[PDB]
Amino acid sequence: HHHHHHTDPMVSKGEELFTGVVPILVELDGDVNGHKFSVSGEGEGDATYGKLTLKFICTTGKLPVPWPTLVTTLVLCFSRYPDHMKQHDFFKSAMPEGYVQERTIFFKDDGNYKTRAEVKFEGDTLVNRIELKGIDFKEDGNILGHKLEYNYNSHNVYIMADKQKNGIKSNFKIRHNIEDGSVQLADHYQQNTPIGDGPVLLPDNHYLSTQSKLSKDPNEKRDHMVLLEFVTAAGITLGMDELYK
């Protein structure tokens, strides 16, 4: 699994927290053009396989934006980092004290989300607590008019160190499929910083390869999303010239 046996005791510490299946709670408070809503999510993460299983419920009634637009906002510490890359796993290294994750998400020709989250352990539970603010949306556009398909694409998200912040940054493009066959671009800008003052791992440039499947619970009457997601780190090669040459 294993996941204690690394020569680096800092790596060992972070990896230990994510051995096995870890329960997850997600809490989001949102306001988009004054449309207020809340989401609660539950499930588990198995970082050894890069695997996330989560069910989200809108606890205020009808979600006023399409569920796919919230996927990126609603725990990259469950990414599978290859053994030769484990020195570049910022997310696990910040645990259990945790990290702040902040984004601005620009929906092209529409409004923007600004998000601030804190991701940390509460006992055995990995908790993602989020505030989301959206402004300048078209009230009958693709987001507030619910014109997006209920599905999700696969991505390569590039991570860079942000050294003077002692953290990381990323910018990446998500396309949401529009029901007429077109696409709604959501351009993501992201930064993460540790919550503790302890040492963290600042990574070399690399990327996260993501894939997500959205489904519905056939017995659930509340507005909700079921998410099955896999995330794997990649983009750094090993030695020696090469192991397989």
Residue numbers in the entry: -8 to 65, 69 to 239
Publication text:
Notably, methods such as RESOLFT (REversible Saturable OpticaL Fluorescence Transitions), nonlinear SIM (Structured Illumination Microscopy)5 or pcSOFI (photochromic Stochastic Optical Fluctuation Imaging)6 exploit reversibly switchable fluorescent proteins (RSFPs) that are able to repeatedly toggle between a fluorescent (‘on’) and a non-fluorescent (‘off’) state. In so-called “negative switching” green RSFPs, the on-to-off transition competes with fluorescence emission upon illumination by cyan light (~490 nm), while the off-to-on transition promptly responds to illumination by violet light (~405 nm). However, the development of RESOLFT nanoscopy in live cells necessitates RSFPs that switch efficiently even at low illumination power (to minimise photo-damage), display minimal residual fluorescence in the off state (to maximise contrast), and are highly resistant against switching fatigue (to sustain a large number of successive on-off switching cycles). It was found that variants engineered from fluorescent proteins of hydrozoan origin (jellyfishes), and notably from the well-known EGFP, could fulfil these requirements, giving rise to rsEGFP15 and rsEGFP216. To shed light on the switching mechanisms of rsFolder and rsEGFP2, we solved their crystallographic structures in both the on and off states.
